[PDB]
Design a protein around this ligand. Structure first.
Ligand SMILES: [Cl-]
Ligand SMILES: [Cl-]
Lengths: 259, 259
């Protein structure tokens, strides 16, 4: 039998581990191991976002998950949306624990510009946020920009190809979050020796209404990847709209990083 | 077109509003209004269970939902498992807002024994807690007993007839909870003039492995209902294993209390 892999899955801002509830059993039925991280103030994490004042604090449960792996184990690290930023922060700390980073409908940062750069670029040309609620929270680290998605924005821009049940679930579970853009704009740039050394692929949905295909090509042109996979018909929440096709993409990646 | 109704849906201990993600759109597509309540320290509520020391505090979100209804509106109030206790507490406060109580695989308290009676009986009877973790927390008014479901327990006793994705989702979202047995033992008996005045029906799954079909009969024998509905092949989490059959039962209940 083909050697199986351990996938570590990292969710998007304002969501939680729960988003992987369709994908996780598909991977485990194929014989792979899956860890679905719950970031700080996400899902059922007990902290409010107001208590998590920096991106490193946000990302700590992922760093802990990697720190805790047995010696010499390497994972397939999948980051979704803002999850791309978290996996890049993880790869600058534990590069040798990661076989390949998988940027799934994700922010793909570089090692030349400040770590906020690709978010700043998107926020400039984002289109509408709809009924999304923006608020500020003042901290010792400076002012944190918070957001709470609105349900019309969710339906139109994130979940438009998802079953109604998944949209209802999402309504029931999403939380106020942050993209930590202030904090990312002050952080030291991601390193070529850490992050930049790790193998990376991109998986894009063809109907992502949040992270459009032109912006993705821009990111990749600033920071190349070894291969691009496309999921036809996926919305942004591709693990909910097209879990099987996502499985297929992940499987194809895993067959490339046998070794 | 026949008259539609507002269903207020109340989840079990250690879960949250999310359990209703399948049922809610089935009920709304038929023209009914649904409010899926999140109780305190449940789901994404921001409190820990330790902070909610009394069943009244636990149930506050449900009381608030009922208080906020316009004048003269009446709902079908569905309580699932522990949710039976919550809906009896609500019916003792706002009996006039409730067209009918639906006890869904639920604890069905009486107006004769102390409020904890049916919980205390199940706890004497039941020998399948498995890898459930039991613990205490001392409050200024007494010991509060807590529980955290174990995953094996969940699979065997609650989710055995659910899709594997539902079980994975539940692993991702269940929380430490409580049946408030000490607080319920100290509380005034449920009243005849409030709770006991409201119409009530029971909906039972035929394969409930935590609230056994014989114990349901014992409760109903102890405190009668207008009508009993049975969902064939449902496990305890029948809104996840048999959501269309549950929708059928609720649709039948709405037609008997039509107005
Ligand atoms: Cl995001
Ligand atoms: Cl319960």
């Amino acid at each position: 039998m083909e050697r199986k892999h351990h996938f570590v899955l990292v969710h998007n801002a304002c969501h939680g581990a729960w988003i992987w509830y369709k994908l996780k059993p598909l991977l485990e039925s194929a014989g792979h191991r899956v860890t679905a991280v719950e970031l700080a103030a996400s899902g059922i994490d007990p902290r409010p976002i107001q208590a998590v004042e920096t991106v490193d604090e946000y990302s700590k449960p992922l760093i802990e998950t990697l720190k805790s792996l047995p010696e010499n184990e390497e994972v397939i690290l999948v980051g979704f949306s803002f999850g791309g930023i978290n996996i890049a922060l993880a790869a600058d700390i534990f590069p040798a624990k990661i076989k390949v980073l998988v940027f799934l409908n994700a922010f793909l940062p570089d090692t030349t510009h400040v770590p906020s750069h690709v978010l700043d670029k998107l926020m400039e040309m984002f289109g509408g946020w709809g009924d999304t609620e923006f608020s500020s929270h003042e901290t010792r680290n400076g002012t944190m920009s918070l957001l709470k998605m609105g349900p019309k924005f969710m339906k139109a821009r994130l979940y438009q190809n998802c079953p109604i049940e998944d949209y209802e679930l999402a309504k029931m579970l999403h939380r106020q979050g942050s993209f930590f853009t202030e904090d990312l704009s002050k952080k030291e740039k991601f390193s070529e020796e850490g992050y930049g050394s790790v193998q990376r692929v991109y998986v894009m949905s063809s109907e992502d209404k949040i992270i459009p295909c032109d912006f993705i090509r821009w990111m990749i042109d600033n920071f190349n990847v070894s291969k691009v996979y496309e999921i036809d018909g996926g919305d942004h929440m591709v693990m909910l709209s097209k879990p099987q096709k996502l499985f297929d993409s992940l499987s194809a990646i895993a067959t490339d990083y046998m070794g």
